[PDB]
Ligand binder design. Structure first.
Ligand code: FAD
Ligand code: FAD
Lengths: 164, 164
């Protein structure tokens, strides 16, 4: 079988929906983060999620060397946070965490305390696939905001949820 | 750093949101599918998605032995499909695919033609982590309905999308 064209693959994907997260890190290699939607739960013992991140990025370099990271599922009101960590407005990497919303929990990685879900994590394993590092991370702390319907991405726009 | 309790992990995840897919298969080891939300795109060259499925699933062994599968992102109108494939009504596998909305495209796996997005795939890699097989699959064909509006899962209920 022949795989679909890359362009057709991305077009089709725009028609699926995802949550939106920010993955962030800090430690001896410094502070960094990027917006990431390719994230999912893997198993509960040990509690493990994975995230797939293009290895060419500033943030990927730092995340992999710090060896710790946070995954921060954004609430409906946080599209600007997502835009910032996707590089909309070209906000310099270390200027991205200037606000009380980020604090430390267990690892030293910055946690978004008003995110719908925040997992503080250590990296356990990495599987490289084409351009992306698939990073398997074990959850060593969790946090939740009070009142957060999700930020959703779909058809290249942000959205949130409503009952069926 | 000690990991969080499994129970905390699961609770936290209920507060995140995910699309809802049905992962289906067919071939020499038979028909099977199940509903899966632990799915994401990995890279576009080659076009690869991954999905995490509990090895306890009846459908897991059949999917991995057939070597082929589809991922079907369900639309807002399709909660009954999600329910059928999560085992509600305990519908027998073959009978799950009796409806003519399920066709073959390229691999032989059943593809839901009216699903918001359907990727027909061949398995490329399987990495077993805790209770789950993380299955990497390369996209060989696709199909999309005209209706992309997502079925979403969140706080243990179905939802769909709204503008912000
Ligand atoms: C919103 C949502 C998201 C989900 N996400 C995931 C996910 O990301 N990963 C995951 O692993 N699960 C996921 N699930 C769970 C999943 O879909 C199922 O609910 C789970 O696998 C249990 O399904 P089952 O009741 O069909 O049990 P199973 O044991 O998996 O199978 C039972 C029924 O289906 C298949 N049969 C069973 N035994 C035999 C036999 N001895 N001989 C011949 N035929 C047999 C069975 O045949 C039977 O019809 C999700 C469910 C929901 C609702
Ligand atoms: C809602 C959203 C989700 C994103 N998810 C991821 C992800 O899971 N993994 C990742 O490495 N980067 C993701 N990004 C990209 C990322 O956050 C930065 O924008 C990127 O590192 C910036 O580099 P660039 O200027 O070359 O932009 P780009 O040329 O746009 O980025 C190029 C490469 O890194 C960025 N991938 C996966 N989903 C998306 C997406 N919806 N939009 C754009 N790129 C995507 C890509 O993945 C791609 O391989 C996402 C961006 C947004 C807005």
């Amino acid at each position: 079988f022949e795989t679909v064209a890359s362009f057709d693959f991305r077009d089709a994907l725009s028609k699926a929906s995802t949550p939106v997260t920010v993955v962030a890190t800090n430690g001896p290699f410094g502070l960094a983060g990027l917006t990431c939607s390719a994230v999912c739960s893997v198993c509960d013992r040990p509690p493990t999620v994975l995230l797939c991140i293009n290895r060419k990025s500033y943030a990927a370099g730092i995340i992999k060397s710090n060896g710790v990271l946070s995954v921060n599922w954004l609430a409906a009101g946080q599209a600007v946070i997502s835009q910032t960590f996707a590089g909309v407005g070209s906000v310099p990497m270390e200027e991205r965490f200037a606000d009380k919303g980020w604090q430390t929990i267990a690892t030293g990685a910055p946690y978004r305390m008003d995110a719908a879900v925040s997992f503080d994590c250590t990296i356990a394993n990495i599987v490289d696939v084409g351009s992306h590092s698939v990073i398997f991370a074990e959850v060593v702390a969790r946090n939740h905001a009070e009142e957060c319907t999700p930020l959703i991405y779909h058809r290249r726009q942000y959205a949130t949820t409503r009952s069926l």
